DNA sequence: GTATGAAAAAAAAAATCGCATCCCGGTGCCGAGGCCGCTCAATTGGTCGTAGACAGCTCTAGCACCGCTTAAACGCACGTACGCGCTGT
C-alpha cells in the first residue's frame, strides 16, 4: 500500500501553485463575501465583474505575502508548522495592529 | 522675511480647552507640523477625489469624502459634524 | 456567513505559495479574521469612492483607488 | 472675517488661499476652507485637550513634548492617525513585555 | 512631431498636456515633458527587455504578466522601485526556505 | 463610447525596438500601462512638490531631473538621468 | 559588597530611559558622522545646527522603533537576548532589506 | 571612520528604551550597519533637495522633506 | 508496569543592609506671555466665464434563469514527524 511520508506532498503542492499565477479562492464563495462586506456599508450595491476580481487579486497576492511574512517567523522559532501567534507577530511588525 | 505659522490659533484654541494651561515652543512647533501635515493629506485626497471625477472644482463636499476616507470612525463622526456645522453657520450668516 | 467559503483547502493554497510546509488548524480562523479585516477596511474606501461618486454600482478604479490609499497599488486595472 | 461668520478661531482666509496657490485643483469651492479649517481646529483641539490633560497629570501648566506623544499614543485612534509620524522630543510610552520581569 | 526631435516613441506631446492638466504647477518648462517622455520610455524599455527574454526562457513570442513579475522581481533595482506594487496574474517567485528542504 | 487614452502603441513600437519577434498578452499591456501612470505620477508629485517647496511657479526638466534623482534607484536614475538630458540637448538643437 | 544580579539594573535602565526623552548618542560624534557621510555626495557643505539635530531624532527614534520590533523577534524564540538575526528579521519584515 | 563615535553604551541606551533587557555583543556592529545605511539613504535624498536649491548649506527643512520621502515623518521641525 | 513513605534538592519566607528612586522645600534663569509698529493678506463687491446641475437617450453590462458535468470540498482515521518541555554544559 503506497503512501508518501508527512510533508512530501505539501512540498510537491508549493512547486506546483508557486510556479501557476491562477487564483487560489473559488470566484463565486469570494464574489459573496464582498457582496456580504458591501451590504455592511450599503444596501442593493452593484460591481463591476472586474471589481470583484480586482479585489480577489490584491486578497491573495495580499495573504501569499504575509505567509511569506508569517512562514519565516515561525522558522525564527526553530518551527517548520507556521501558527497564529506567528501570523499575529508579522502583522505587530508590519504595523497592521497594535 | 515673515514666515507665517498656526501658532495664535492653536493658543486661542488651547484657552478654549485648557483656560489655565500653557504649550512648550518645541510643542508649538509639533502642533504646527501636525496641522500642515494633515492639511496636505486632506487637499491632496480632495485633489485626487476631483481629478477620479473630471471635477475642476474642490467643494466642501470633496474635503468631507477625504476626511472620511482619512480619519478613523468615531475621529471622522465628529471631524465630519464640527465641518458640517462651520459650512451651514456661514452659508447663514452671509 | 460567507466567510466560511475561504475553504480550509483555499487557504492552504495560499500559504502553499507563500512556501509554507506546515499548518496549524489554529490558522485557518486566524486567516479568515485577517482576510475579513483586509476586505474590510479596502472595500469601506472602494465604496466611500463610489458614493462620492453618486454611483449605485463599484468600478474596478473605486477599488483600485482604494488600494493604492491603503498603500498596496495594483496595476493591471487601469491605475 | 470669515472665520467670524462660521464661528471658528482657524484662518478661513488663509485656508482658502493656500488651497488655490497649493496647486491641488483650477477651482476651489468657497465652502471647502471653511469645512477643512473646522476640521483642523476640532482635531488640534482634541490633541491639545487629551495633552492638557496628561500636562495636568504631570503637575505642569506648560505642554512640552512628551505630553503630545503620550497623549497621542494613548488615544487608539490619534495613534493610527499619526502611525508614521516621528514627535521630536516624544520618547516612548513605558512598555516592558512580561516575560523581561524577573520572578 | 516634438517626439522625433528628441528621437523619442513616447508623445512628448501628450506629457505636456498632462502636466498643465495634471494641478502640478501654473508654468511646466518645455524641457521637462521630453525629459519626462525619455525616462518613461527608458524604464518602459528596461523592463520589456527583461520581460522579453523571460519570455524566451519560457519558449513564448507573447510577454504575460508573469513574465513582467518574474523580470521586476529578479532585477534588484526594479523590485526596490516596484515594492508597494501589486502585478495583476504575477504569481511569486519559485523560493522554497532552505530549512523546509529534507536531509 | 468613451475615448480612454493609453499608452499601449507606444509600449509595442518600443517592444519592437528591444525584441522585434515578441509580443505581449492584453492582460500585460494594461500593467505597463498601470507602470507608467504610476511613476508619471510619483515624479510631477516630487517636481510640483520641488517647486513648492522653493517657491518656483514653473516646473522645468531641472526639477523633473531632481526627482528622478530621489525616486530612482541609483544605476536606474543615472541611466534615466542620462536619457533625459541626452533627449533635452537632443530636442533644443533640433531646433 | 553590594551587587545586583544580571539583569536588574537593566530593567532599572530600561524604566530610566523610557520615561525621559533626551536624545541618547553624544551630539558631536553623531554631527562629526553625518558630515563625513555628507562629504560623499557633495564637499565643503554645511548644516543649520537644527537640520543636524533634526537627523539625530529620527536616528535614536528609527533606531529604538527597531529594537522594540527586534526585542519582540528574540522574544518570539523564547530567547531574551537580542541578536543579529533578530535584527535581520524585523528589517525582512519592515520590507528594510531583501 | 566616526561610526565608533555610536559607542556600545550609548546604543544600549538606545535598546533600554526600545524595551530590551539583554544585548548579544555582534548587535553593537550591526546597528552601526543599519544606524549608517539609515543616515546614508535620508542624507542623500536630504542633500539632493539642497543641490536643487542651489544651497551650499543643507537646511532642517530640506531633512524634514526628505524623512517625509522616507515614510519616517518628523514633526518639530516645521513643514 | 502502578499507590506507600523518608532522606536528596530545590524552592519559599523572613531579619540585616544598603541602595537607588520619590517627595519636600528653596535657588536661579530663561523662555513663555502680552505691548507696538508695521505689513500683508483678508473683506468688499462688481466683471466675467465656466463648472456642474438638470433632465433625458443609449446601451452596458450586471442580476437571475437553467440543468449537467466536474473537480473541489468535507470528512475519517492511522500513524509519523513536529512540536514542546525537561535537563545539563
Ligand atoms: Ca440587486
Ligand atoms: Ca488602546
Known sequence: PH????????????????????????KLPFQRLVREIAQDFKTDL??????????????????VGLFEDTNLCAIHAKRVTIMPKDIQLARRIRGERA | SRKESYSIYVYKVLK?????????????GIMNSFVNDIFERIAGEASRLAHYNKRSTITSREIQTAVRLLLPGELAKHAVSEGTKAVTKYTSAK | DNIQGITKPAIRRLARRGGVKRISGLIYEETRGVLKVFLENVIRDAVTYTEHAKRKTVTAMDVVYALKRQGRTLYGFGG | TRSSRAGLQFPVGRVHRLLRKGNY????????????????????????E?????????????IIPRHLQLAIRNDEELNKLLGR?????????????????PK
Do not use: W
Request: aromatic share 6%; proline share 4%.
Open chain 4, 50 to 62: 487629551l495633552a492638557g490633560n496628561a500636562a495636568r497629570d504631570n503637575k505642569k501648566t506648560r
Open chain 1, 3 to 26: 503512501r508518501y511520508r508527512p510533508g512530501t506532498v505539501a512540498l510537491r503542492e508549493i512547486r506546483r501553485y508557486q510556479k501557476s499565477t491562477e487564483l487560489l479562492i473559488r
Open chain 4, 85 to 101: 509620524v516621528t514627535i521630536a522630543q516624544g520618547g516612548v510610552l513605558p512598555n516592558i513585555q512580561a516575560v523581561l520581569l
Open chain 1, 46 to 63: 452593484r460591481f463591476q465583474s472586474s471589481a470583484v476580481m480586482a479585489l480577489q487579486e490584491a486578497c491573495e497576492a495580499y495573504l
Open chain 4, 25 to 48: 485643483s483650477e477651482r476651489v469651492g468657497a465652502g471647502a476652507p471653511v469645512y477643512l479649517a473646522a476640521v483642523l481646529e476640532y482635531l488640534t483641539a482634541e490633541i491639545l
Open chain 2, 16 to 28: 478654549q480647552v485648557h483656560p489655565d494651561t500653557g504649550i512648550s515652543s518645541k510643542a508649538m
